[PDB]
Structures are given as structure tokens and as C-alpha cells.
Amino acid sequence: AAGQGKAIKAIAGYSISKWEASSDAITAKATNAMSITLPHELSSEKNKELKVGRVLLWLGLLPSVAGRIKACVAEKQAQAEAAFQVALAVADSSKEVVAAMYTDAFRGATLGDLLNLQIYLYASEAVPAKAVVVHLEVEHVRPTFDDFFTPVYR
Amino acid sequence: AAGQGKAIKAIAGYSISKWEASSDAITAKATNAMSITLPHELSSEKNKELKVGRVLLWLGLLPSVAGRIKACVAEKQAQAEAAFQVALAVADSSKEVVAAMYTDAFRGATLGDLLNLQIYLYASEAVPAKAVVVHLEVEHVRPTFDDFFTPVYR
Amino acid sequence: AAGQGKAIKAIAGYSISKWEASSDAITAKATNAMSITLPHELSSEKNKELKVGRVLLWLGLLPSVAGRIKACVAEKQAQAEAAFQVALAVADSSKEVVAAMYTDAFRGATLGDLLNLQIYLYASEAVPAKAVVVHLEVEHVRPTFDDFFTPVYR
Amino acid sequence: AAGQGKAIKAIAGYSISKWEASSDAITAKATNAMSITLPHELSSEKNKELKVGRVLLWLGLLPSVAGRIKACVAEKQAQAEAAFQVALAVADSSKEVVAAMYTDAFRGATLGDLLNLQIYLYASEAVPAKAVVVHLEVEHVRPTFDDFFTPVYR
Amino acid sequence: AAGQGKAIKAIAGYSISKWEASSDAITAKATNAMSITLPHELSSEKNKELKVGRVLLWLGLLPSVAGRIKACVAEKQAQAEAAFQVALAVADSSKEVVAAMYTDAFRGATLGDLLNLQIYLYASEAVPAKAVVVHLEVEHVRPTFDDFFTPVYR
Amino acid sequence: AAGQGKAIKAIAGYSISKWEASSDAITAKATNAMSITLPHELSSEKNKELKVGRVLLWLGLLPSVAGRIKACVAEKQAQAEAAFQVALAVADSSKEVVAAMYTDAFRGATLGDLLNLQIYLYASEAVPAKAVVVHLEVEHVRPTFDDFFTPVYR
Amino acid sequence: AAGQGKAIKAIAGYSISKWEASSDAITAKATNAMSITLPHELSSEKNKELKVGRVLLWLGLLPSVAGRIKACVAEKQAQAEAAFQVALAVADSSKEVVAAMYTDAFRGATLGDLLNLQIYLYASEAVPAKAVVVHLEVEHVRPTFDDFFTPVYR
Amino acid sequence: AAGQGKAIKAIAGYSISKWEASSDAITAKATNAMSITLPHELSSEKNKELKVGRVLLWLGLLPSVAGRIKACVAEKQAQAEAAFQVALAVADSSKEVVAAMYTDAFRGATLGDLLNLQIYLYASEAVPAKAVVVHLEVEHVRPTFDDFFTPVYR
Amino acid sequence: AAGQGKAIKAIAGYSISKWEASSDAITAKATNAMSITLPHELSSEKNKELKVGRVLLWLGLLPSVAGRIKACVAEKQAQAEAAFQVALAVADSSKEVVAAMYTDAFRGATLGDLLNLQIYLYASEAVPAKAVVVHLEVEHVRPTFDDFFTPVYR
Amino acid sequence: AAGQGKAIKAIAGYSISKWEASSDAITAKATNAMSITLPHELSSEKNKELKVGRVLLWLGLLPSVAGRIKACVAEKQAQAEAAFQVALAVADSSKEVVAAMYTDAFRGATLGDLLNLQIYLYASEAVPAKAVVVHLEVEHVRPTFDDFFTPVYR
Amino acid sequence: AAGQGKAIKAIAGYSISKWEASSDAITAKATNAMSITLPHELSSEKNKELKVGRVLLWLGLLPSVAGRIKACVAEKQAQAEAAFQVALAVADSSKEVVAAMYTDAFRGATLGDLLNLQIYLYASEAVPAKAVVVHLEVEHVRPTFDDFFTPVYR
Amino acid sequence: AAGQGKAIKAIAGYSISKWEASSDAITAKATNAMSITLPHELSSEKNKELKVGRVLLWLGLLPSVAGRIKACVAEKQAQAEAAFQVALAVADSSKEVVAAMYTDAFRGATLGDLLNLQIYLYASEAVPAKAVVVHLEVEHVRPTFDDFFTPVYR
Amino acid sequence: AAGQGKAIKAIAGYSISKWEASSDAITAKATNAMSITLPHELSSEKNKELKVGRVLLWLGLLPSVAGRIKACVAEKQAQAEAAFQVALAVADSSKEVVAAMYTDAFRGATLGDLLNLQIYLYASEAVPAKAVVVHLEVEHVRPTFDDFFTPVYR
């Protein structure tokens, strides 16, 4: 009566940018480490400084993909494997809900800082490239738009 | 509080149309792609323009049906398999709740647009035809009725 | 805990009648179809017309019963198997909650109509008779009692 | 008033259960002593403890039944005849109103206690069996009904 | 200290229809069983569904008629004699008041149901035909009347 | 009108003491004269001075007791027979109600005075001893109870 | 106190029943154990359920009675002697005040429970029978009296 | 104000009459029984009807008087000795306070009734006559005084 | 509070004069009779007329003094011994409190009248002279002081 | 939200008593039936009558314990196995939450009644003794505590 | 002492725990020294820290126990005998009230501290074991109860 | 409470200092005279001038100490024995309460003055040294405490 | 009106300290028992006394770690294995949520007490060291900070 019929809503002043990234082939027990790339509209300097709120990560797999997939967002790791030991949430294909909701892990940071983070992706068995799409949804402060025309009328 | 003895209610002004569709045989690891067909009462032009709200999809399987079934609603795909990587919800027979609730995926669209969508249905093992019934429940704006007689008495 | 602590309560004017029914042996993949029998107190004509609200169905199995059990309430079916494809709820022993709550499936009907319904019971493996007790709980309008003595004193 | 076109009503919270018992042949001047048997619905332990209010007893005789019939409710008697000397009310076929209304004789007792009471029936002349039906009407606290389903939903 | 110059009045919304039926010869100790026949104005379908309230039955006998007459209204009986053992009221010529007021026996039923009832009439001695008139007074919901003319000025 | 299901209630400040007395054999047309004996609890001096209100007397006879019985309460009589000519009320077995309600005959007197009264009992035919129980119900001022402990702790 | 001229008063709604019991001969150092017997007026079922408040016990001895007497109220004991070790109060003839006031020992219990209690009586020297009177005063809820006459008037 | 040097005061409308009585010789273990004699001023008929409240009794002994003295006020006894077993208070020379305060024993009685009472006096050893003075103090309704002269002026 | 850690206080307008008197030898069972001597300051005529309130008398004995001592204040007696039978209070060395508080015995009298009273002192055994000090404390109206100088300055 | 960072709280007036019981060895597919034992503090008569509310049962197993364990609370069963078919809740080690919350199954009963209940424990494989601890938590009316000392001080 | 009819009541927030301890044989003039043992319910760590208020100690002796018994509570003594010289209260069988009320001796301390105290018990004559029961009543802060179930539902 | 569960409290502004003194051997009938010694904290000049209120003195004796002990506080006496004849209170071991409360004897005096007083102690029989502890409790004006630091900062 | 987008928040006045601990190799079916170490900032005396609220424990494992891991917090155990039978919560890698939330297990305790607790960690298969990171999060009263400089300026 407030969850399965309604979606989770952004806070006042923020909006949600969503984008994806396709996986690269991954060998059994391996852990690839792709990086975050902001969508063009958010790459400006003015935007790369917008403050982040919550971050959600979920996975889209081909029905065929067998095995177990796990993924998460954490800072660059000396050892990929280890990301999963410190990540504050993990999207795991074997659970009921295959998603990772970072409630405060990056709250306060800003887009751009997200560029220094990484998405670690593990698979228990070999998985073809493009077989896993990683969806990322970032709640951040709503960007500002231009309110004035260039002043050409002297 | 402590209980789910009430179903999710339609929003003010909307009602929920429910209908089903029987599956066609499906071979192991295959992904059939049946299409949405509005119920006759909703096929009129006046109706095919009623705005959609939420859309629920669930599966009815024969108890015997072994294996894993997955289904979802998405736009026509170049590759059937791929639908599951972008669908915003998936009904999966291996989960506790085998249903897919599209909260906003089609909100704003109108019936008829639903005609351009598809229902992708995957099975990990061979499945006889008619062994899976796909239930579809669309919350849409309530159609209008005639409140006036033909003007005969001049 | 915080998961609940309270049971689901009947609506105003209604009460809940509960009764059970023991299973008959059932062979692997089979689907028996026992029928609903109102409790004596509800068999009168006056009562068989009391309106139904919600209906709950749950299973009580012997610890030993191995395999998977599924059950449901639906109208007489040409094919037993098929009941599970149209039933609005299914009690399934493999889930966390092995119960089926029919929120509106029979709301409005009346006891007695329940007599034309059936309880389909499936088992993935052979199961001895009496190994499964099917509990049925019907929320219906509360029956009336006499408020007057026979007018004897003239 | 101007007359009784209204029956006597049960006090608040109580209802009236009515049932009968057929007589056994009875010889002139004799006094049979049949016993009270609660109706099945009231035989449960939960019910056998419902408090009693007023109790009414009346007789239904074949038109042909000649002679005088008297009946009453009292505790088991050493001497049947004697019941009529202590009973607080007696139904007598020779009176205008052939009924016995025990206003307080059993008020406070509970159903079940009624099981330890007896119905003494006298006849001045020989009377065939089944020729007299003894109607008993008991005003008692209304039994309670279940308001909650079984807590299933976790 | 009240009064006895006032008859019992029908409740709001109801009215009282009265009619009679003449007896057929009746032999000593016998019990004839004539049946209820609604008055023509009440035989329509619209009316045969009007709800009943109270029902009064009284007897009109020739001064000469000796012996004892009893009468009552009850459902069709296997044994005529037995009606008097279950009837909730009996008109008996030997009492001060020779009438039977069914306060609730048929409350709720409807006219027409009255057609399935019977009037049992007993006499302790032989009685010529037409020597007893059985008056019947039924309080029922007031029938509705037409408030509109046929719409012709169109 | 309803209320024929209520007993006559004692006035404010008073309560009703009830007790009985068994008859002694009585020969045809004779008139025995037993006397009033207060119940032990009322024999104290403090109590024998409680003021009386109404007094009720009724009879309990063996069903068999044939003939006519009459009884009443009056002051000691020179001639037993005569009591019935001055008694303000008489219990008579031939009437509808076999009781005598002295509304004011002893109002104002006190218990104890009742000791100087007598119960005259007449029978039209011979009657065995113990065949008639005379019930006596006296409404009197409610006796006072002790409100203090003995003063020992001083 | 403010001087000592007032007795201890019963609480609202309660009254005090007082009664005594005579002793049986008692040998030196012996401990007799007589039992509590409610006064007739309190032996009814209605009364044996009246709640107790405080209980007082004091002794009345012949002036001649030499030696020391002790008494008390406690539950049936395996060993008479031992009663005095657990009794919450003891009446002792050698003290200034020879009484035992049980303030809460039996508060809440009901008359009748008092029947399961005992009065232990010890004497340091031989004492004739009847030489000691044991007074008992029980504060209990004020018993109820009949407020209705037997309904003889229909 | 506050204190410990205040005597116990008579209730409103009452006053306290005090008087004494000298003892008669008394032999060891014996129990004399002198009687109450109202003071002359209280012997009038008008006064012998004044209601009593509390009664106090104390003893005045010669310093020499050895042994133990006990006294009390109770109704005439069959056995002198026995008075002490029922008296509600006893003045005993061996106690700290040699007095007996009858708080309610005679409350309600009237002077004169006091004439039917007795003062039992026991001594453990032989005691000369006049060696014990028995003081008696009675709180009673204040006798009324004449407020009118004789109507001499007609 | 008032009689615990606080002494009993003189009433308004009064004060308490305290003084003592030494005893004269006293032989076993004897009763000396010393007399009251006002303190010099109270011997004036003006003072000897001050009204008395309460009077307290207590004894001070040598630790060694064995036996029992009794004392009191009463009017001159024909027989010393007898004082103790009429004195309204007695100071007794065998009691808890060895004092005599005359609450009203001399209330109203005046100092000087005290000169006509006597202090009777009894001893059960021989007692040396000066071995008992009799303390006397009289509450009386406070004497008046001079508020004016001699009108010498004109 | 209030999430599961808060435990389920007892209703006003009640408190929760928790205690455990160690298992006895159990053979494959067997079903032991240990019984409930109230904790000492609750064994008193005063307590064995405290009303129960909700009851929770959960299991504590050794990490090593392999197989499936099920447990429940029900009345003594003819057949242990059968308890699981009628129990209103079952703690099952294979579920997410291994507990059984009886919301109303024993509401209204009292402690002590719990003594007539049993804990049935089943295991799919052999399990050593003490390998399973059964925790029981009973919500019941809070026991009352003494607020008064023994009335020692006179 | 102070108030009769009423027991001394606990201060707001505290309650009274009562328990006993049986004596061990004791030889003439000897002084045993048993120790305090908290009742199980109070042995928990949470409880052993509940603050104490007043403490009462009284004795229960067999009627036969001759001689004088004294008892008290004090800290462990080098010399048992000496306890009685410093204890702030002593229960003495020779006094009117055989009890010891420690008003402030242990106020502020906590249960548990009571464990470091001792109960010294003296007897002037030889006394069998178990012949003296020492009752101990401690007023302490009211212990707190569990208001939550174990958080099992996560 | 009742006044038996509360100690006597010091007056506003005052506090109570308590201390003891051990006795020196004392021969039969002798009277030792130990002197008062203020506790160190009270020996300062500032304190020796604090005003006294009430003074309490009680005795702590060895259980064995036989005989009679008496004690008191008075000014230095020419004759020890004599102190008891003028002391305003005496602690006497033979009384119920072995204490001496000087309500006004030293009120107004100051500590230090107490140094000029003496404690006289008498014994009827020989008593070892240290066998009697004399407790002294003095209510006096509460000593004042410094509210300022030394003015060091100049 | 949303769902799981919020984190459980600390109560007013408290904050949450989080820290971790790396595991040591662990052999199949073994149960290591590491101990709690407060973070430096919390090791001060001032802090080790800050009260605890809720405690959360969760595990971070290498994706590769196969087998089942269980962990929990409990007091030092005689038998490691046994911790899991009494811990009020267990983090289990096989469940949906691998965490243990101690809602009240340590509420009230203080940091430092946590030092006497242990973290038991079990594994069904051999696990390398450092392969499991145990996260511990403690909600405790917020520590205070210094608000003043050292008073160096005189």
C-alpha cells in the first residue's frame, strides 16, 4: 500500500538521469571493471558539479545467460575481486531483486566524481560480450537552464 | 498495520481492462514474440486514444510445466532475446511473485500504441503450446458513454 | 520483528467461517479436484444466500511430504491442469507463504455458489491420502438470530 | 396497551434459540420426565458457557388430545409429581395461555446447566406417544464469531 | 391503566387486506385443510411479491354450532392433525378470544407464498358445510399506483 | 405492546424474602389454619421490626390434587371458614391465576406482626398431607448490615 | 488515631459478617485445628462467590483459663504447629491486644475459599472444651437480595 | 489544634453521664455480677428513652489489691464466667490500660435498656468488699430542658 | 508529630509552671499524703486566682528504688488508700509511661485551690526518704505584667 | 519508513516472557514431541491464570545441523506427524524466516493452558541431542506485585 | 506502630518482594548468623542494581518455642553478639510487635548489597532447627519487563 | 504508610549528627557517668556554636546482657544516682521502647554545651565493659559551607 | 507512497560508528571466534561509557568464496558452535539479506561492554584468510566535544 504499486520518487530539487553500458566478455570466476561515463548533456563543467543523492544499479541479462552475475559500484580497487567486500550494496542475479541501491554511498559527491568510480562485474561462468547490460540511475540536483537571450539589442 | 488483504486500486478516472493470450509451443532456450491485441470493446477509434496508466503482466502455467519461464513487454525488437535486457520489469517463474508491474513504462501512451508493443516469452526447456497463459491488465482512462438520445422530438 | 504481529481482520458486518478437507492420494504430476462442502450450520436456505467477501486457502502438510504441492479455487474445469492458468491465486508449497488469498475472485457471490466451485490440488510426486489438509476460510455476511419469543402470552 | 400485536423482544446482546421435543406415551395421572438436549450448534464448549436470560416453555397438542396436560421445567426431582410444587411457572392446557415463562428462574445460569434440568409432563388421562410437542425457547447471550483470518502472510 | 377501545394498527407503509373462506362439512374429530386464495386485486405478479408483516385469523360461527372448533395457518402437512402441534398460534372457540395472531410466523414472506400455506380446521363434533367462516387478515406492503398518464402529447 | 416478560419489582429500599410451608392433610370442606414462621435470618429483634410492603401468596399443588383449593392470609379467626369473607385477596385453584396479592393489607406492619397472622387453607375434597405447598413472598425494608469491626485494636 | 473512640470501618460496598465457634478440649502444648463454617445466609452459591476484603479474628476466654493461648488462620497444614510460622497474623493471649487482623492475607479470595482455610488454636496448658470462643469477622462484598416477585401474574 | 493530651470527646448532641458503683467482697476465681443503676436525674420516663452512643468502663482499685481483676458489660448471663467470652471489650488490671470502651455494643440502645445489662467482675484472688470501684461513663443524647413556664396567665 | 518528637503544648494565653517536691520515707504498702505548695511567684493574691487548665504529674526515682510506686492528685481523703479509687489518673512505676495527665480534673479551678488538693504516694515496699521526687506541672492562665510607670512625671 | 529496525511491541498491559528448551536426539523423518514448561516465576496459581496474547516460536540450530527442521505448537496429538497439518504456523529452517508467530491461536487462553500444549519437532535427517534449541516467547498479562508490607505494626 | 486496618504501602515506583529463610538449630545464648539470598527473579544483573527503600523483618515461631528470640539485619560482624548493639532495629519475641522496620538503614543501597549483609538470630534457650522462620520484606524499585519480541521478521 | 513506616524528621535548617560511646564495666546497682565528646567535624569553634534542637539517646546491648539498664543525659551531678530523679527522659531496657527523647531539655543550647553534660548509666547487675553502646543523636543547626574561593587573582 | 529508498536512521541523540574486521582462515565446518575492538576515537574512558542502541552486522565476501558463511554476535561461549543457538540474530550468506540486526540484544549496554563480546564466524567449507570482511555498525550515544580552551590567560 505504498511500494509495489508506486515507484520510488526523487527528492525535491533533484531529478533522475538514467543510462546504460554494455558488458565485455567475461571468463568464469573473473571480475571485469568497466568505468562510469556521464551522458553528454551532463559532461559540461557547470553540470559535473551537480550534487548526487541516491544511485541505483540493476542488471539486464539475456534469458540464456547461465551462472551467477554480481555487480557493484565502488572506488578504483587494487584488486577487482575485493570491491565486493566493501561495496555498500551488490546487484546479484541469484536474489529476488537483482539491484543495488546506494542510499548514501555517494550522497554529497557530485557527477564527475562518479568518473573516478568503477563498476565491478563478476560472473561464475563464461559470459559472451554484450550479454549483460548494466543500468545506472543517478539522482542528482536538477541542472539549470538559460533564462536570457544573448543581449544583441545593445 | 500488518497485512496484504487488499488489491492495488486504479487511480481516479481510470479503470482496469484485463484479458489474456495463450502461448504457442516454444523450444528450449527459445524466445517467442506474440503481440498485443486489444479487446473488441476497446478497438474503436474513440477508445484507441484513451491514455494508459500502469500495466501489469502475469503468467498462468500448467502445474506440470517444468523449467523456467520469463516474459515481458517491450517495443518490437531486432533480437527477441534482447527484450529482457531493456524491459523495465520481467515476470519470472522462478521468483516468489511471477509478475511484471510496469509503473511508468507506458504511462502517458494510449491504447493502440500497445498494438506496437510485443510480449516476449522465453522458456529454458521445451514447452507445449497453450501451456502458458499470458495475462495482461491495463489501467487506462475510463471510456465515455452517450448521455443523450437522438434528437427526434423536434 | 516488524513483519506484522496482527492478522487480517474481517470487514464490518462480516465474520469468518473456517473449515478443512482432507486430501485423497495423488499420483506424481496429477491434479485431483475435490469440491467445496459448506459446514452444516451454513447449509440452511437462509444462509446459503449470505454474501461472500474474501476467501483464503492454505495447506497443512505432513513434514515428510516431499515434492511440490500447489492448490487453488476455481470453477469446474474441463481440464483440471488448466485451473492453475486462470486461478487468481495459488497456494504453492515452494514459496515463502503457502497460501492463496482471493481478494475479489468471489466477492459478491454467496455461500452455496461456493458449492459449484472446486479445489484443484497438484503434486509433483506421489502423495499418500490424508497427507494434505486443505484449509478454507470464508469471510461472509454474518447470519441473523431470532430476537423475539413466540407471541404466546396472547 | 390496546392489545398485543407485538412479541416480547430479547434483551440487548442476547438472542433466542428455539427447539422442540416430542413426548412419550403417558398414562393417566402419570408424570413423565424428559430431559433437555441442546441443539448441536450450542453443544460446543465455547457455547455451553453462554449465559441464560429468560426461558419460555409452551405446548403443542393434537386437537384430539383430551384431558388436562401440565408441564414445567425444574431440577431433577426425587419425585416427579413434586416438580409442580416448586416450579416457578407451569404450562397448563386448561388455562387461557398454555405456556410457562421463567423470568428469572434460570437467569444467570448457562446453557449446559440446562442439561441438568428436566421437563416434567403430566396428563390426567392416557395420551399416545408423540401427541404432545414441548416447545422450549431460551434467551441467551449471542455466541461469538471469528473476526480474523489465519495469519498467513508472513 | 390504559385502554381497550382501539384496534391494532398496521405499521408505516403497510395496509391490511381482509377476506374470508367458507368451510366444508366436517365430521367429528376430523381436520379439514382448505387453502389460501389471494383476492383478485392481489393476484398480479407485481403484487404477489409484496412483503407480509403480521397475519390475523379469526372465526365466525353460527350461534348453533356446538362443540369445539380450532383453526390455524401452517405449511402443508403430511398429517393434518399435526399442524396444531407446530402452528405458532391457534384460534380456539373455547377461549375468551377466538383468534390467532401470527406476529412473525410469516413476516418477511410475500403474498403468494401464502398460497403454499394452508388453513387447518378441526371440529370436535360434526359440523354442516358453510357453518364456519374463516376470516383472514394480512398486513402487507402497500401496493403502488400509476402516477403518470400514457405519454401521448408527443 | 411488550413487557409481559417482566416480573413485578420491589420498591426502592426494599427486597423480597420468599419461603414456603407444607400443608397438613385436609378433609373435604375443611379449613386448616397453619401459621406464619419467619425464616431464621429474619427472627432477630433488629429484623422483626423491618416494615412490610406488599405480600404475595401462591400455591404449588401436585398435578393429581383434584378438587378446589383456596387460601389466604388474615388475622387469627374465631371461625376458620370466615377468614375468606374478610381476606382482601384469595388464592383459588379454579381461577386463571392462583395467587393472592395483598397490596396494602399489611403495608406498614412489620415482620413479626406476620407471626400473629395465619394462613387459612380450604379444600373441597380430601387432600393428603404435603400435597399443597404454600409459597409466601414478603416485600420488606432491606435489613441493615454491620459496617464496623469490633474495636479490639484499641 | 485522634484519641481512640472509633471502630475500624468497612470499605464502600462491603459489610461485615461476624460469627463464632467454640473450642474443643486441648492438651498442653497441643494445637487443635478447627475449620471455618460459613453462616447459613452465606452458604448459597450466589453468596459463596462474594469477594473478601479484611478478616479479623479474636478470642473470648473464661477468666479462669490459665496459660497462653494463640490462634490464627491459614491454609490446611501438613503440620498444625507450623501454621504459626507462616500465618501473617496471630492472636496471642499474652499480648495487650489479643487479636489477628489479616489486612491482605485473603483480600481478593471469596467466601467459600474460607472453607478451605483452618483456624489453628494452641494452648500452653490443658484447656477444657468450650473454654475458648473464636470470633471471626469477615469483611466481604455486600450480598444481593431478590428484587422481583415470582411472576405469577402472566 | 494537635496533641496527645486530649480526652476522647462526645459526638454532637450528646453528653456524657458518669457514675460509679462499689464492689462486694469477691472470692478467688469467683465472678460477681452487679447490675446497672441509672442516676436519679436519668430515671424519669422522658430520659429512660434517650439513645446511647458509646460506653466506657474502667476500674479504680486500692493500691494494695493484689491479683488480677477483670470486668465487663454484657447481657444477663446463664453463667457469669461466660460473659467474658462474648463481651466486646474487657477491663483487665494486668494490661497497660485498664478500661473497656464499647464503641458500638450499645449504640442505638437507650438508657434503661442499660438496666437489663450487668457488670461482671472477676478476681483471681480474694478481694475485700469496697476494694474495687467500677466507673461507668455513658455517652447519650442530651436530655432536653423546659423552654416554657407553666401557662399560668391562662 | 504531635506526641512523637514534639511535646504537648499549652493553649493560647496559658503557660506552664513546673516544680517538684521530695518524698518522705514510706513503709511497705503505706500511702503518704504530701500537699501542694505553690512556688513563691504564684503565692500572690493576684496570681492565686489564675485559672488552671491541664495538670501533669510524673515521678523521678532512684535507679535502685525497687518495688512499685503509685501516685496521684485528689482532694483530701478520709482514707489515703482510697484516693486511687477516684483519682482520674495515676502515675504508676510499673507502666510504660509513669505519669498522670489530668486533662479536665482541675480545668476551671484556680491556683490556690490546688492548695486544698493532695498528692497521695504509695509504695509496695519500704522506700527511704528523698528517694522519690514528685514533679508537678500546671498549665494556667499567664500572669499579667505592669505596663505603666508610676505617674510621677505629672 | 519504520522498517525492521524496530521489534514487534507488546500490547498495553502485557509483557513478554521468553525461555528455551533443548532438543533430544531425533532420527530421520521422525517427529519428537516435547512439552511446555512454564518458568518458575510463572508457576504460582496467581500467575497460571494470566491471559495470553500472541506467542512466538523460533529455532536456534548448530551451524552444522544439516537437513530440514520444522517445529510448531499445537494441542496433544494422537499422531505427532499430524500436528503440522493443523498448526496455525510452522517454523521451518528452509524458509527465509525460521519462526512461527501464533497471532490468535492461543489468545485468550492462560498460562498453564500452555502446559497442555506441545512442541512438535521434525527433522528430515538424524540430529544429535541438544543440537536444536527451541525458543518460546509468550506475550501475557503483566503479573501484579505486592504494594503493601505485612501489617506487623499493631 | 501507627495505623490499624491498613498496611504500610510502598512508595511510588517501588514494589515489595517478600521471602523467607528457615533457621538452623540454635543453642542457649548462642547467636547464629544466616545470610541473605535474593529470590531467583531478582538475581539477574539488571535487577541486582535496583535501589532499595525500606526493609522489614519479622519472625514466625512454633507456638511451642519457649524462651526469647531476637533477630536483626546488619553488616558482617567480627562478633555475632555485637550485631545487636549497632543494628538500627531488632525483632524481639518478648515485645508486643515482634518485627524490625529498617526505615533508612538500607535506603539507597541496591539488591545484591543485601547479599553482603547478614541476619543475626539469638535465642535465650535451645531451639530445634526449622523452629524459626525469618521473613524478609524488601521495598525496592520496580523491575522492568520485556516489551518486545525478538526481531525475527528481520 | 501509617506513621509506623516513617522516621521522625529534623526541622527545617537542621540536620542530625549521630555518634556512639562504649561503656566501661559497671558493678551491680552502680551508676557510671561517662561524658559527651563531640565528633571531630563538630569540634571547630565555628561549629561549637551551632544551636541544638532535639536530642535522642538509645541503647545497644549484647543479647546476653541480663539485668536492667537505665541511662540518661543531665548536667554534672553531685550524686550520680540522682541524675535519674531530674532527667526529663530515661532510656530503660525494661520498657517497650528503650530510648530517651529530650524534646526541649537542650533546645536552644549549643553543641559544646553538650560537653558540660554527662551520660549517666546504671545497671541492676554486674556488666562487662563494652557490653553497652550508648547511641546519641543530636539535631542541630546545619553547619554552613564556604561559597567563595580565596581571592588569589587579587 | 514509494518503497525501499531510505536507510534506517539513528534515534535522537545517537550516531552510528562503523568499522570492520578481516577474517582469519577457517576450515570446513569450523567456527572461528574473533573479538570486538573499538575504534581508537572510542577507546577513551569518557567514551567507553556511552550507551548502545542497535547493532548491525553484515558480511563482505569475495565473489569466489563458495560454501555457506554464518556469523553473529554473542557473549564469550564455552563452545563456539553454540553461539548460533542463542544469538538473537544471524548473518547467513544463503539468505536474501546477509545481515544481523540486533534490535535490543545490547540496547542499554555501553561501548566497552562490546569488548567482552565476540563475533563467531562459521563456514561450511575451507575459506582463505582475509576472504571475509565483517562489518559492524553500532548506534550509540553521541560523544561530547570540548567547548573550551585551556584557561592559559590567567
Side-chain angles (χ1 to χ4, degrees), chain C residues 60-85:
Chain C
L61 329 191
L62 281 310
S64 50
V65 176
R68 190 179 183 188
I69 312 302
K70 299 180 185 179
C72 67
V73 176
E75 312 198 302
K76 277 140 189 173
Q77 212 86 317
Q79 212 62 303
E81 282 272 301
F84 297 87
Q85 292 189 303

Side-chain angles (χ1 to χ4, degrees), chain G residues 37-130:
Chain G
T37 311
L38 279 62
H40 197 288
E41 319 72 69
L42 298 167
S43 304
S44 78
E45 246 55 303
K46 183 69 177 179
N47 294 327
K48 279 187 177 184
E49 289 174 52
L50 288 165
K51 294 210 166 185
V52 175
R54 291 168 293 190
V55 174
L56 175 67
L57 179 166
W58 56 281
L59 306 173
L61 329 187
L62 280 312
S64 54
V65 179
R68 194 178 181 190
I69 312 299
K70 296 179 185 182
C72 67
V73 175
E75 315 196 302
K76 276 139 190 173
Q77 214 85 317
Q79 212 62 301
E81 283 273 302
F84 298 84
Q85 290 185 302
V86 294
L88 299 190
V90 180
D92 179 336
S93 69
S94 76
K95 307 290 187 184
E96 273 292 306
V97 192
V98 184
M101 173 69 91
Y102 300 86
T103 291
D104 303 283
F106 317 109
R107 177 186 302 297
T110 66
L111 301 171
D113 296 44
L114 303 193
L115 291 161
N116 299 315
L117 298 181
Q118 299 234 84
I119 290 179
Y120 297 87
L121 183 50
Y122 162 99
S124 71
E125 311 187 317
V127 173
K130 310 304 165 199

Side-chain angles (χ1 to χ4, degrees), chain J residues 54-124:
Chain J
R54 292 169 293 189
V55 173
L56 174 69
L57 178 167
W58 55 280
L59 309 170
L61 330 188
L62 280 310
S64 57
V65 176
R68 193 175 183 190
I69 313 301
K70 297 180 185 179
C72 65
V73 177
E75 315 194 304
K76 277 140 189 172
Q77 213 84 319
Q79 212 62 300
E81 282 274 300
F84 298 84
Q85 290 186 305
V86 295
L88 299 189
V90 181
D92 181 333
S93 73
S94 74
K95 306 293 188 184
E96 271 293 305
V97 192
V98 183
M101 173 67 89
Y102 299 86
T103 289
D104 302 284
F106 314 114
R107 180 182 300 296
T110 65
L111 302 167
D113 295 41
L114 301 193
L115 292 160
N116 300 314
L117 296 181
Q118 298 235 84
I119 292 178
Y120 296 86
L121 183 49
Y122 160 99
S124 70

Side-chain angles (χ1 to χ4, degrees), chain G residues 129-148:
Chain G
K130 310 304 165 199
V132 164
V133 180
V134 183
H135 296 276
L136 200 58
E137 295 179 25
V138 187
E139 166 189 52
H140 59 65
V141 178
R142 211 172 297 184
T144 43
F145 9 60
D146 222 326
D147 290 305
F148 300 92

Side-chain angles (χ1 to χ4, degrees), chain M:
Chain M
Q4 322 302 296
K6 297 174 182 174
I8 140 65
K9 181 179 183 183
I11 63 190
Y14 293 64
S15 65
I16 298 176
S17 300
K18 319 180 183 185
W19 71 86
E20 40 190 285
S22 206
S23 78
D24 305 299
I26 166 179
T27 65
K29 320 292 182 184
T31 300
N32 299 5
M34 44 218 275
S35 40
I36 288 71
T37 309
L38 278 62
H40 196 288
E41 318 73 70
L42 298 168
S43 303
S44 75
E45 245 55 301
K46 183 70 177 177
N47 295 324
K48 279 187 178 181
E49 290 173 52
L50 290 166
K51 294 210 164 184
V52 175
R54 292 167 293 187
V55 173
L56 174 67
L57 180 163
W58 56 283
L59 308 169
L61 331 188
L62 280 313
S64 52
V65 177
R68 191 178 184 186
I69 312 300
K70 296 180 186 178
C72 66
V73 177
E75 313 196 302
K76 277 139 189 171
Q77 212 85 319
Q79 212 62 302
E81 282 273 301
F84 299 85
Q85 292 186 303
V86 293
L88 298 188
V90 179
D92 179 333
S93 70
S94 77
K95 309 289 188 186
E96 273 292 305
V97 192
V98 183
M101 171 67 87
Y102 300 85
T103 289
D104 304 284
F106 316 112
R107 180 183 299 297
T110 64
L111 301 172
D113 295 39
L114 302 193
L115 293 162
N116 299 315
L117 295 183
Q118 300 236 84
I119 290 177
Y120 296 89
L121 180 53
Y122 162 100
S124 72
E125 312 187 320
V127 173
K130 307 307 162 199
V132 166
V133 180
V134 180
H135 297 277
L136 199 62
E137 294 181 27
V138 185
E139 167 188 53
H140 59 70
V141 175
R142 209 174 299 184
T144 38
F145 6 62
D146 215 342
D147 287 311
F148 301 92
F149 279 100
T150 284
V152 299
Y153 273 82
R154 300 284 67 177

